[PDB]
Amino acid sequence: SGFRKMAFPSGKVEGCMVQVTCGTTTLNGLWLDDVVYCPRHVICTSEDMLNPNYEDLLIRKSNHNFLVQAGNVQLRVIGHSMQNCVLKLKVDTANPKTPKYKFVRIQPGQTFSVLACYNGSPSGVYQCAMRPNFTIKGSFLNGSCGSVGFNIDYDCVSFCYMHHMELPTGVHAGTDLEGNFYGPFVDRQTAQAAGTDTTITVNVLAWLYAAVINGDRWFLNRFTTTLNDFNLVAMKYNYEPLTQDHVDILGPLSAQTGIAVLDMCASLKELLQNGMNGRTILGSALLEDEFTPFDVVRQCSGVTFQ
Amino acid sequence: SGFRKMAFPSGKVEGCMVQVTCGTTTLNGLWLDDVVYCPRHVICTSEDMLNPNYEDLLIRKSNHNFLVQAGNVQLRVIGHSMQNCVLKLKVDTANPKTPKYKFVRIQPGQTFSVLACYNGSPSGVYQCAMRPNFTIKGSFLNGSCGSVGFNIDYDCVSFCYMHHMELPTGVHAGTDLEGNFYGPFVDRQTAQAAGTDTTITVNVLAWLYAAVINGDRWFLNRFTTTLNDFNLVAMKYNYEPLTQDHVDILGPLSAQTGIAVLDMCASLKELLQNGMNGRTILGSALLEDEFTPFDVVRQCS
Ligand SMILES: O=C1CCC(=O)N1c1ccc(F)cc1F
Ligand SMILES: [Cl-]
Ligand SMILES: [Cl-]
Ligand code: NA
Ligand code: NA
């Protein structure tokens, strides 16, 4: 029993974290095979960051301008190039701890584990969702740039996020490992507002199923609804639209619990319109939207990653 | 900026997780140097659940009755002994991935990370606290016994918890790594119930300080309180008493924010009285009590 916000075991990624220094700037890099990946803004001074020309800033750098340390051992950089917003430092040694891995770009609403790092040393792990507005509600201090986000499939690490910057509201923006930003952001010191965010409806439903599995049932009711009717409710409450694919993905949980998705949708409609009336669900007084259907099934089934 | 329930990176503990089998029972063990630690109830049969005599069950076992699998490798058991409620299997290989480590018994209110495991393979990592009633609110399925809780200081792993059982309310009970249970619980299936649980007051205050550090002040007020009046109020909400130890521990956070500890207590008193009135604090609509003062300083720096 029990339901917790759970990250993937982080060991496979810890073995890949290194420290990258360029000038007066130190941040984190990801060492896989013989390449270290890090944010391209490592090469900027603070005035550069005001309006950077990254290709021009880079031409002026030699390989020896990039100090890379894996633990206590220096790595020799032998090449350097940019892919979108990610700098790629070719090194003379392949990481012997390289796991089976892929670079994947995730969709808003999907969750992943963040390994927060400083000076190349992992400091904490936590679970995030890519918000509909393409930010993440992370916890990062100065020095955390280059920390990465990931999922694990079987023994394969799917890297999906590299941390680049914080927005004025205190939420976070970054790229995939091919350097493409999530969201309408640019790597430049300018204030850049996140758009108004919405709630991830399919994930709220998954969490309500998690609640039921764990014996928390007070919000169930006799009613059902239609997609069209429910989606008018969702739009009114700044929830994301629920699609038929969302319904299909929740199929397993509907069959396991005896609560059809539209049946559960009628529970959510009543919760939106009436509130919780002083009650909680899985210990929360808010409707939680950072568990995916897969997260719920995996945690209520005990899948492992040795 | 930001504030998350954050666990320690789990890799140092992942390298120690093994599978222990005895009879038809499989659970997890912790392999450190040449010893594997696991719950002693791995030797129980279906008839031994209510009143097992562990000394009598153990004397009947040979080293080769214990199967210990590390990855795809069988380890050889060359000795066994019982320490309180934990079995120690001596094996013929020192774990080459053994981190710097210690065993530390914790007090209620302390937090730690849990690496949930099944069949010797890690599943997920999350953050827990030792509740005042000596249980933890974990996420554990059948097969998770032997999963451990830990903190990491510098690069030294402090192991503080080994999972043994789930109580009828769905909360969890286990031991330190010397095999002594937290709380009044025993490794028998006789009826046991956790005490009424209470809120960890010092941790709530730490978390309110985190909220101020991250830029939120809406819940403060112009008032203060005596320590005794605060405790008289807070216990009516099933909050733990706040001690002078707790007030002293909150000194650093008070100094950083400029809010005296008893002034923060006055804020808490008002929040218990008023609710949040539709607002949130660090993204929560309830008061959070599983961050310690030490956690807050480490995360907000
Ligand atoms: O430097 C950056 C990159 C992203 C962004 O929005 N900012 C920023 C600028 C000015 C501020 F006052 C606060 C900020 F977060
Ligand atoms: Cl109906
Ligand atoms: Cl909440
Ligand atoms: Na219903
Ligand atoms: Na293992």
From Swiss-Prot, chain A:
Location of the protein in the cell: Host cytoplasm; Host Golgi apparatus; Host nucleus
Catalytic activity: TSAVLQ-|-SGFRK-NH2 and SGVTFQ-|-GKFKK the two peptides corresponding to the two self-cleavage sites of the SARS 3C-like proteinase are the two most reactive peptide substrates. The enzyme exhibits a strong preference for substrates containing Gln at P1 position and Leu at P2 position
Active-site residues (renumbered): 41, 145
Regulation: Inhibited by pyridone-containing alpha-ketoamides compounds 13a and 13b. In turn, alpha-ketoamide 13b (tert-butyl (1-((S)-1-(((S)-4-(benzylamino)-3,4-dioxo-1-((S)-2-oxopyrrolidin-3-yl)butan-2-yl)amino)-3-cyclopropyl-1-oxopropan-2-yl)-2-oxo-1,2-dihydropyridin-3-yl)carbamate) inhibits SARS-CoV-2 replication in human lung cells. Inhibited ex vivo by michael acceptor inhibitor N3. Inhibited ex vivo by compound 11a and 11b.
Signal peptide: none
Domain Peptidase C30: 1-306
Cytoplasmic side of membrane: 1-306
Effect the entry attributes to changing residue 205 to V: In strain: Zeta/P.2
Glycyl lysine isopeptide (Lys-Gly) (interchain with G-Cter in ubiquitin) crosslink, residue number(s): 5, 90
Superkingdom of this protein's organism: Viruses
Subunit architecture: 3CL-PRO exists as monomer and homodimer. Only the homodimer shows catalytic activity. Interacts with host FBXO22; this interaction promotes the proteasomal degradation of nsp5.
Described purpose of this protein according to its UniProt entry: Cleaves the C-terminus of replicase polyprotein at 11 sites. Recognizes substrates containing the core sequence [ILMVF]-Q-|-[SGACN]. Cleaves and inactivates human TRMT1, preventing tRNA guanine(26)-dimethylation of tRNAs. May cleave human NLRP1 in lung epithelial cells, thereby activating the NLRP1 inflammasome pathway. May cleave human GSDMD, triggering alternative GSDME-mediated epithelial cell death upon activation of the NLRP1 inflammasome, which may enhance the release interleukins 1B, 6, 16 and 18. Also able to bind an ADP-ribose-1''-phosphate (ADRP).
Protein name: 3C-like proteinase nsp5
Gene expressing this chain: rep
Entire protein: shown range: 3264 to 3569 of 7096
